[PDB]
Every structure is written in C-alpha cells, then in structure tokens.
Design an enzyme around this catalytic site. Structure first.
Site, PDB file in Angstrom:
ATOM      1  N   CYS A  77      42.186  34.968  49.785  1.00  0.00           N
ATOM      2  CA  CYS A  77      41.575  36.083  49.044  1.00  0.00           C
ATOM      3  C   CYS A  77      42.505  37.297  48.842  1.00  0.00           C
ATOM      4  O   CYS A  77      42.387  38.030  47.845  1.00  0.00           O
ATOM      5  CB  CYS A  77      40.300  36.515  49.769  1.00  0.00           C
ATOM      6  N   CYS A  82      38.887  40.885  53.306  1.00  0.00           N
ATOM      7  CA  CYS A  82      38.961  39.790  54.254  1.00  0.00           C
ATOM      8  C   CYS A  82      39.598  38.564  53.581  1.00  0.00           C
ATOM      9  O   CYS A  82      39.644  38.450  52.346  1.00  0.00           O
ATOM     10  CB  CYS A  82      37.570  39.474  54.820  1.00  0.00           C
ATOM     11  N   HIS A 110      34.132  36.581  42.545  1.00  0.00           N
ATOM     12  CA  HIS A 110      35.320  36.536  43.384  1.00  0.00           C
ATOM     13  C   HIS A 110      36.241  35.402  42.938  1.00  0.00           C
ATOM     14  O   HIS A 110      36.257  34.345  43.550  1.00  0.00           O
ATOM     15  CB  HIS A 110      34.895  36.364  44.843  1.00  0.00           C
TER      16      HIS A 110
END
Lengths: 398, 396, 396, 398
Positions: C87, C382, C352
């Site tokens: 991520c 995160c 996302h």
C-alpha cells in the site's frame, strides 16, 4: 422385430451464453430425461441403456448417458454411454439404440443427446509434463475442434463455415437465397410456437433466479432479408465473394434431447404410443472441405436400403448447418418450390440453433410428431457432419 | 448373418509417461490400423466404418475413428466415430460393429480403441465466463474422471482405487492374495512374450526406434517384493491393501480388428477367428463398480444359454487384484479356473490403456481359443461409474 | 538540494469490475502520464526516470515505469522501473524520486503508481515442471496475496481485514464509530466533487466516453444504511464490525507527478506545490498491520524536528475504519483534528487502488495545502504484511 | 556521507530446473540473508530496510524484501520491499540503499536480489472475466516478459535473443568470436572455483535430497570452441546467419544475493570492514530491440559524473546476457584482448548463470572482493536491461 420411437422430446434450445448458460449438459439431459419419464409414466427399471450423443465430453461427466441416468434418479442398475459422430451424434445414438433393440438384446432403451456449448471446457496438453521448455497452450474446445476434425491431411482452417463457402462457390449460391432460407426458418419456428405444436416437443426447464423456461431462445418473428443483408460475411477479409453470415448460419447452443426406443410389443405392454419405426439408415464419408454435402450420399444409402426414392418421402428434416450448405444439398436433390413445403416445417438449425449432440434428437422429435400430425408415411432425417461425413435415417409412421 | 472377428491386433502397451509418451492417441491408432490393413491386405475402401473406444476424447481429435481413418491414409469415403463406456469402450465398439454387420447394414467395419493416457488433457470449465466469484479450477482429466463417473449422488473421492478397497473389505481379500494374483499376471505376460505368441497380436510402433514389446511386465516380480509396497490409501485406511503393484496402471495403446461376415471374410482371404455369440451389460453401485462383470456375464451367459462351466477361456480385465478376486469369488473359482483365465496376462501386468483394453483382451481371447482348439470364450470387464460388460465368443 | 513536487494528478478511481475494467494498469498509467505532460507542457526528453509503485506486476508489463513511459510516447532514452512496498508503493516511488533528484543525479523524474485490480492475473506454479502427481492449482493474485504478505511465521488467514478486526478488538472500537467515519469519508468526497476542487487532481479517462468522476463515492451514505451490512468475518467472530461499507475497496487507477529541483521547475514554468521535508518507514506485527502509520509517523516527525501538532494537514489512507480509528486513538485525536484529516475523502470512499493510492493522497495533500495556505502536511499509510510509511511535505 | 558496501555474498547459482528447483526465491533469499548476518554478526535490529531486486514477483511473496526478512527470523520491526528494473534490479536495489543511507535517512540497510527462475509462474489475464469472446492465453512469466518489455510501439517478438542477433548483425560479430568469449567465461569461473576465491562470496544452501550445496551448477571445465561450434542457433530457421546459442548465452538460473549498505561512520562503530564505496551511477534508455547496448550510455553517464574515463577503471563486471551482446559493448569501448584481463575475471552470466534479480549482487560480490585482492582502486559494474535500458555503477576500494 421392429424398433419404434416413443415420446421424442427435448428441452428448449438456449443460445451460447444465453438463458441456459448456468446449466451443465448433464443438467439439460436430466431435465429432458425426467420429462420423458414423467410423460410416459413407465417404471425406471424398464430402461436397459441410456445412449447419448455428446460432442464435447469431459471428465465432469464420463460416459455421459450413465451420469444422466444416475443424476435423474434412475436405478444404479441402468447402464449408459457416450457416442460422438459430431453433428450426427444424436441420430447415431438412436440408430445404435434401434440395432440393440431389433437384435433381441434389449426391449427398451433411451436414446438422446446433450450439449452445453456455453460450458465447453478450455483444455491443455502441456501441463501434465510441464511447459518448462514448450510453453503452455490453452485451447477453446469449440474453436479448436473447427480445425481438427479432418485430421492432419485435410486442413480446413476456417472449419465448417469455410466448407459452407466452398459449397456456395461450387454451386453458385447467392447471398439472397441464403438469407431467404434463413427467413423461412425463423418464420416456421415462430409459426410453430404460436400454433401450439412445440408444446408436445418440449420439456420446460426450471432455471433459477423458479422461472420455468419453455420457449426456444433463438427464433425471431421479425427476421427479414433486408436486415440480414446488413450482416458481414465472416470470411469477407479472405474472400470477396463470401456470403456466410451469423444470420444464415446455425449458432452455438445449449439443449438436450431424449426419446424411448423399444419394440411394438413392449410399448403396448407399457402403454406407450409408438410414433415411428426405423426403416433404414445410411452413413457416408465425403471430403472434409466439402462436409456439407454429406447428407446426399448418406441419404442415397438409406433410401436404397429401404427401397425408396426421395419422392417416396413425405417429410424431410435436414439440419441446416449453413444456408449455403443446405441449399447445395437441395440442389443435388433437384428441389422445387414444392419441396420446401415438406422440408424443415418447424424450423431448422439456423432459427432454432445447433446444440450439436442434441440436434439429432430435435430433428427426430419434430419429424416423428409431424409425420403423425399430417398422417404422412415416410420421413427422412439427415445431416452433414464436421470432418466430412453424413448420416441419414428413414422413418415410417406407425 | 454371423459377425466374425479377423486379425485382432494391438500396439504394445506403454507405461504412463513412458515409451509412448511422445505419441498421441491418433498416432497409436493410426499405427494399429495401418498394421491391420497391411496384415490382411484388404483394400482400404472395403472399410465401411471405423468405430473406436476412446475414453478421454478432446478436440485434438473429434470423432476419433474418423480422424484415425484419414490420418492412416484411408479414403475420405470411410466414416468413423467415437464411443465411451469407460473401461468397456473397446468391447462396446466391437459389439456395435457386430450389430451393424449382423443386421446387414455393413459387410466389413473396423472396431477398436485408442488411448494415450500420457497425454490426457488438463481442463477447466471456469475460464469462459470468468472465475471472479467461483475461483478457477483446472482438473486432471484422469484424476477428475475417477470421482465423477457415478454422478453427483455417488461421488467416489478415492476414485476407482477406493472401490477396490471397498471390494477387498467386503470380500475379506488379503494383501497376499492380491500380490499372488499380481505375480501370476506378470508370470503369464512374460511367459507369453518368451513363447513368441505375442508377435501375432502386436503391431510394432516406431518412435523418434521401433518398439514391439510391452513396457510394464517384469520377469522378476515376487510376492516378497510386492509386500514391500505401500497401499495408496494407507493414511485413510490402516488395513488398505491396494498398491501400484497389485493394480493395473495408466497406459498408452491402440487396438484394432476387422468385423465382417464369413462370406466376406472368405472372398478377402481372411481367417475368421471367432464369432460373437452373445453379450450383456449391467449397472452396479458406482462405489462397487469392480463387481460389474458378475451380472453382465450372467446376462451374456443367459442369452447364450450357457453356464460359466461351458466357457473354455476367460478374459477378465483385472483393474485391481482385489476387484478381480472379488469377481472370481462370486464365480467360485478354484486354482484350476485360474488356468483358463487371463492366460497371457491381464491389466495388472500389461497395463490398462482404457479405450484400447477391450481390443487387447479380444486379440488374446480370439487367438488363444484357436491355439487351444477350444470352443467358447468370455470377455468381461468392470467399468468405472458402476457398469459391467461381457461378451461370449465362439471359435470358428 | 531541494526536491519539489509539481502537478500531482490521478485518473478517476474505478471500482473492481467497474468502469475501468477493460483498461490495463498500463492504460491507466499512460493516460495519467500523458495528462501530466499535457498540463505541464514539459518536453518528453526532459524526463530522466519513470518510477511507479505497482503491487500486482506481471509480464504483460515488466518494470512498468519503462513500459508506461514508452507507451505514453516518451523517447526510448527514458529509463523506468517498478517498486512494491504494498500500500505504501506510490509514496515509496515519490521518496525514491526525491532521493535521486536531491542527490544531484537527476534534475527531473516522474513518480507515480498504477493498479488495475480488475485485471490482476490468475497464476500457477504447477505448470512448468508438470502437474500429474501434485495436480495443477491456479490462484487469484488478489485472493492469494491476502495470506502471504507476512510470510510463513506470521500467518494471518483473513488477511488485512482480519488485522482490522484485531485493531477493533484491541481498541474497543464500536461498529457505529466505524460507520460514522465511513459516512464522513463519503461526505467529503462528494463535497470535493461538487466544489470542483477534484477537477484539478483528475486526468479524465477515455473509454470505448470520457470519464472524470470517481466511481465509488455516494452522496447518500447514512449511518443508518451502513448498519445493515454484515461483517465479512461475522461467521468466525460474532463481535465482528468490519464490513464492505467501512472498508476501502478494490479499485483501478494511476497517479503521476513531477519531482524536480526548484530551479528546473522555474526554468520550465512549473509551479512547485510542496517539498519533501522528511520520511519514515517502520515494521509492525503482521497481525496488527494497521497501526503501521504510528511508528512511521514518529520517525518522520522526528527527522523533521516536528511534532504531530505542527502538521497542518493529514492524509491517512483508511484501509478500514477500525484501523484508521485505532491510529487516531494513538494519535489522541479530538473532534477538531478530524477536520484537518482526509478532507477530500479517503480509501473508504474513493477506493484503494494499491500502487496508485500514494499518488492520490499526495495530489490531495499538495493541492489542499495551497487552498488552505498551510505549512506542513503528513501522508501516511498502513502496509500489507506489517509495515508503515510516512512523509512530511512543506508548502512551497 | 559515503555509502559503503560490507560482506557482499550470494548463494550458489542453480540451473533452470536444477539443484535449487525445489527452493523458492524466498528460500534462497532467506539463506543468503541468514548467511550475511551470521558472517558479520550484525544485530538484526540494526537493519533499517531490506531492499531486493526481483523481476518475476507474484503473490507467493508480496514486497519480497519484507517477506525474506520475516522468514529469515528478523524482528517484525524490519521493513522491506521489492524493486524491478529487470536485469538491473540487483544493482538498482544497491543504488537505492546507497541513496537512502547517504541522505541521513538510514545508517544501515540490506540490499540484495533473489530469483528462482525454475519457479516463475505461468499466468493469465483472461480468466477473471472469462475468455468467451477473446479466448484464453496462459503466458510463461519468462518468455512473455522478453517480448513485452519495450511496450506496444517497440515489440520484440523474438525476445532478448532477437536483440542479440541484432547486435551480432550490426557489429558483424562472428560465431567463433562469440564461442571464444563463452569458453573464456567458463575457464575463469572454473579457475575461480579451484582457486578457492568463491567460498568468500558464497553462502552454502541446505537442501533435502539433506545436503549442503556450495558450488555453482552451470560452469563446466570441458567447454571448448569445438564443442560450442556444434550447437545450432536458436533463431536459425528465421535467420540463416543466426549465431546465438544456449552455449554462448547466459542461462536461466536460481540464486539470491545480499550485502550491507552503510556509512563509513556506521561501519566503524560496529567494527565492520567495508570493501568499496559508491563513487557514482548512471542509468540510460536505448532502443528495446537493441537493449544489449544499454551499458554503453549508462557507463558514460557514471564515468562523467565521477570525472573518470574507462582508462581509470581497474576492474569491470559486465553481465554478458549474450556473447554477441557483450562483444558489441566491448566493441564500443574499443576493447583490446588486453582488456579481457580486467573484465569478468571470475566468470559471467554465460558460465555462472543469470538469476535475474540476484545477478546485480553477484557481480558486486566479485567486483568488491577482487578489487581488494588486486588492491586496485576503481571498479565498474554494468548490465544491459530487457526493454532497452542500461545501468552502471562505479565503486572504489576502501
């Protein structure tokens, strides 16, 4: 002793990717088989074999007639099997059933066919031993089979459709005529729907959403030569004179067909009503690149065995794999306007579809029931076969 | 009319992934068919149909009998087709051939079988409309088919091998009995090799070297040696007995014979070996498939108005020693019956190239009847999915 | 020397299976990159490197930065590459670009990210050396990566979502609080739409129709409605709270920006928005992954000689509401702090698209720091498998 | 601050499908990393990042540096990641570790590479939504990557090999020349083995039938120009002048590489013995179909930044993806036969193998250790990159 056909039924015919997309070939076969058994009311232990035409088999259902029988709740004492003679597989299954009943071996068996072209597998021969050096090819079962049925010495790159063009070329068959035949096809299917005759042919199929489908997906009442004129020939890029479109060709479809093959004695004893008996059949090989003309030699064989001519035939079922292919056969048969009136009276592959393994059984249900309805005497069922064959059977009303 | 069997031949039988791994089922069938035609010297245009058993068909060869016909260089006028009744497919093709010859429809047809288990496809039914929600599975054609043949209401997770453990359990068949059968099997196959009777059955096959001997049989097979193998389902079942050594294997071969009439045989200078007397089929519980031969044989014997006592020679495909021993317990066999059963080997020693097994058993049965001047022969096999098939033949 | 960010842009964010389903990660990357160059008017041979975060790479586009550069029409002289820190990948790309500009090696490079989660491959490690013995398995790249990011010693069967439940449990975070945050996130996303501020972040995407609107934000999200959704893991945990409504989704997008020196920028008419002050990375337990931003942020604030109170704007990718709220707990956030955090929405409302997320957060933080005439921004996230990344930027 | 390299090590290099085939890229990476920490004694919480070059990533190991850290037993506080600049990836990982250490952000990180080409996936982007209309392809991660790397406007259907023939054709490079280079490569690798120098580079790998492997699988002592002349060019069908064979090409292989990147001041505090410092690096883009020439402009950039010329370079590691490709670069450099004495002195991709992500660290371990054994000053490491890039770095003995 005679072999007679009883209660020839079928499911409706779905389009490839269409209303039956979520059903397996086994699903359709079990429906058709259960429909057949419910209509005839015979005990399940009377069935001595289930013989199914089935052209894209795989290990989801090995020897599919057996699997259909078990999945329909027939006794485990009921044997079954699978046969493939491409487009002729469903008639092959019936002929086989007739031979083993006429021989004295069985009194009653089921003959039929099942095809779910929506769910034909993708497969590979490179994964068992590894593609570490060759790579891994995956094949569409449908697409690959178009180029291989004539083997390595008679290549037809464009498969069956390419051979349909070959016939167009050799017989000088106009696009117009092809789309004209296409239109008649849709009109007869659509006519037959409204005249309520397809109701006795069809086992409705419950799909789930619990919607019961009982109408064929492909026929269209608004089909016209002008609309079809707008369609692009599939092989136009490689052939300027190409005529064969999606509109004057049979599609890829999902369906199942079933019938009972028994002796007149056994049928009377079970309260069955035999519609036709098998008079004769014939098979034949022709050049893979002209497979479409396979019905002509096959029919000659069947007619000769029976001691008939084509003028002795009251009804004709000819699968119309492509309009150009069908017209070629009718040219060889020297057909007039008059002959079309006795040929494919309830539609054909173009309008209804070509769910390969089930087609022989569709044609049979139509032929058997229409001979009865017209109080006609002889019927001819015949089809061309990919890879270059023909099959024909002559039936007579009982 | 009579239907007679002429020149029943077969290729040698290759191990799975072994000597024939580079050959397709069509390659094997083409070689057997050409060897047949070469031996009989019959014109190719005499063949009215090529009917082959073929249990793992795919689009590499649709309606395989037709492809084998054309690839063997036979005229475009010869029809052909494919049949699958699992392990019985080869016999089924022969039976159908007899029906369409006896009926007067055909005078001469080819019946046979072809299987390249080394090259059975992997396949998926999740790749056309996408495996977004379901995920995607790719199945071993061989492995998957072992579990699905009984349909969705009779799955067998351990495949045909589980069904053999079932029969062993039901019939109280010891591991030692199974391995003794296995040793017998190899003994007979090897003896048949050394005796030279196989040269008559086998069409040699060229690979890119010309092979003419079966890959699997071993002269050195012993009960003590076989005791060393671990049962495949040992983890699941502590008293499991079925090993790779008392089982038939996966294999590659093709089988061909002429089916014709005595009159046509004589015009062509063929030597009819046997004629078909009767046949029987039957269904049994998929999880007990291996017993299939018992009721199918009853039917075939009933039809022939014979008893098993009337049978001079028997071909029982031994898919598994435990399965075969269960059949022979129902038949109440003694030591002595073993002497008229599978006298040139069986599935355990020769292998089980499924679609071609029926024609293998016929080539031995037909030839061994003549060699012994015996009268009646029985050919029978169990069939995955819970069927059995049997045929009685009479020496001509 | 200084590294400044110019013109941070992105495509709209498509849903998985949604409006961009037919576009590849390279299709999205090429569009965004062409948009960037179009807006900036920069000559193509002025780009010295194209560095893209890309978390599901495959051989359709190896070293994807280079492929995107060439497919967008930059000359063959422009190098390019791919990075993956799950991520954090898009922020990682920006940080690498800053390092090799600040160092004096390069004067101008492109940093970004690109993900097409709609077209993440299915793959198999069983097809190379053969599948008969093992069988052949084919895995969903997305489904598979859920269980593997922590390695074999710290398994988390339920993936990142399980770690969100872990954080929900540890911090005693109510289902209702999570859904409140989810509504908040949707309100800000739509607000930003209606106010026309987003038109500046977005390069519109042509599909076979031009799209310029994010697919997931909904004007009508209510705490009432979200309450109806079922916790994905409720079967395992009756107290589960994490649903599809209060989680970030799976999505498609690409983000791009210029990283250059203040001088090169002025020389080219570029308007630097921010400069990189500091950054930090951290590892945390894979099963509490979502707390990653807390040590990462401290590292970055420390190297910047700042404290959290000094930050004027925060972008925190909320992979899950429960995760985001845990971070904000540890950050002792009060209602006022929520006003300066994720003011244009977040992962939960915008989606996302893993590799492109870092570039989304940056496009909003850079441009909102100018709208608000503020000084410091924090971007943090995160990371899959137990990591955290953070960067402080300062308005130029 | 300087960036210095300590203890550059590597696993042995396995052949494609060879001795390491049952090991994953992570397995190899964990072993090399455990080996590095066991040799040096560095406390694990001193490592601030694990940055690995890795060219065929998949979901078996996402962000592979993080996975390798965890699986090697490092604390959960150690971050990590994956980078891909193809063949340059291992050098790229080192360069990035140098940037982030020189900048003050980190004092000490691990840079390396890992590749199990034996285990690279086959994959498809047609199975999620179905291939009903498109068909389904399954791609070799390895072969596919070689044709797609230059994008849609620079397709290379023959992959890397095609680009090598291109260089052979444009630089008029003879087969014999190519095979000579190949022979020399094996000689020097084989000599490096027997001289004992490789043990310093190599972390032995435990494998289960348990054995401990510590010798490279591909170098062979019996390599002759005469033997090589016998092999046929892979692209001979297409190109009757094809010269590139598996014998004068680097192989596909499995290995892993690791080293410490840190500052002089940090190394001193921990009592580490830095071997080299990073002087400079350069990167460049070239035509994808001539990718093999990438090192020439990459090296020019690195030398210019360093204020050096090739004349100042005591030692050279150049990955010879192909003899043809390597000779083309040396032709640009105007290399004499004398320069072969300073170039790839312990072998190259052709003999040692080319496990892509780990090749960069393989060349560094040789270069760094050899610079000290010769007490030379400057060394260059450069590589051509698939898709048309070059990467170069100049290192100085400490």
């Amino acid at each position: 002793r005679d072999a007679v056909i009883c209660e020839p039924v079928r499911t409706p015919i779905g389009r490839y990717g269409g209303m039956f997309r979520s059903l397996t070939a086994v699903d359709l076969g079990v429906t058709a088989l259960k429909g057949l058994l419910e209509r005839t009311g015979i005990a399940a232990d009377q069935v001595e074999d289930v013989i199914l035409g089935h052209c894209y088999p795989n290990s989801e259902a090995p020897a599919i007639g057996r699997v259909v029988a078990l999945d329909a709740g027939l006794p485990i004492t009921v044997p079954g099997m699978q046969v493939d003679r491409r487009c002729g597989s469903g008639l092959q299954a019936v002929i086989q059933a007739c031979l083993q009943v006429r021989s004295g071996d069985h009194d009653l068996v089921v003959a039929g066919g099942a095809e779910s072209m929506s769910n034909v597998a993708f497969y590979s021969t490179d994964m068992r031993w590894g593609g570490a050096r060759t790579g891994v090819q995956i094949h569409d079962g449908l697409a690959r089979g178009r180029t291989t049925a004539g083997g390595k010495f008679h290549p037809v790159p464009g498969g069956m459709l390419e051979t349909a063009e070959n016939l167009r070329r050799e017989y000088h068959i106009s696009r117009t005529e092809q789309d004209e035949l296409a239109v008649r096809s849709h009109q007869r299917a659509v006519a037959a729907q409204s005249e309520g005759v397809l109701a006795e042919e069809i086992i409705p199929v419950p799909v789930r959403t619990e919607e019961t489908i009982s109408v064929d997906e492909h026929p269209r009442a608004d089909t016209t030569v002008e609309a079809l004129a707008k369609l692009k020939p599939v092989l136009l890029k490689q052939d300027p004179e190409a005529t064969v479109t999606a509109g004057n060709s049979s599609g890829q479809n999902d369906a199942a067909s079933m019938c009972i093959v028994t002796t007149p004695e056994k049928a009377a004893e079970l309260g069955l009503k035999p519609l036709v008996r098998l008079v004769s059949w014939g098979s034949a090989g022709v050049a893979p690149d002209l497979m479409g003309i396979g019905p002509v030699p096959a029919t000659e064989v069947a007619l000769a065995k029976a001691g008939l001519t084509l003028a002795d035939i009251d009804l004709i079922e000819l699968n119309e794999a492509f309009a150009a292919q069908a017209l070629a056969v009718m040219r060889e048969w020297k057909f007039g306007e008059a002959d079309h009136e006795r040929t494919n009276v309830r539609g054909s592959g173009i309008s209804l579809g070509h769910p390969v393994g089930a087609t022989g059984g569709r044609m049979l249900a139509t032929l058997a029931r229409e001979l009865h309805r017209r109080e006609a005497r002889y019927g001819l069922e015949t089809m061309c076969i990919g890879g270059g064959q023909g099959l024909a059977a002559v039936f007579e009303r009982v």
